[PDB]
Amino acid sequence: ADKELKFLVVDDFSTMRRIVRNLLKELGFNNVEEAEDGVDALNKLQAGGYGFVISDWNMPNMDGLELLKTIRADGAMSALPVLMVTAEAKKENIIAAAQAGASGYVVKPFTAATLEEKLNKIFEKLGM
Structure with missing residues (x-):
């Protein structure tokens, strides 16, 4: 699905953002941004969508x-x-999420092979 899809990691974690940075790169991706909260994502996503x-x-x-x-x-x-x-994952939470655009939900920590399993499972609907 494109070797450079844009990703936004707003995880306040002071180390997780680094793990995904590489992990994605392993899947062939070189274009990610970062934030620290929703107010940050809202102001940082006005970038280019x-x-x-x-x-x-x-x-x-x-x-x-x-x-x-x-x-x-x-x-x-x-x-x-x-x-x-x-x-973990509580159906009550994964529901209100998908009801919007949270369409993707990956537990954590995932192995590049695990994340790859969820991503591919979603792009099957996007058909890239």
Whole structure:
């Protein structure tokens, strides 16, 4: 799916952002940005509309919904694929998420082969 899809990692973690940076590179990707919270993503995504956005779920302060749900509030591009990253997974949470653009949800930590398993499972609907 393109060897340079744009990704946005807003994980406040002070080390996880580094792991994914490489991991993605292993999948053939050289174009990622970074933030520290939703207010940051909203101000940093006005850049050019990333094709992919990775965000934790509650590490910065509130949650990522408002950060994502807002993206959907737009239109013509509410399909922005998002692979939110979280520990474990409660259906109640993965639901309100997909109901928006959180369409992608990968637990963590994942192995480049594991992430590759989820990503490929999503692009099957995007058909690139």
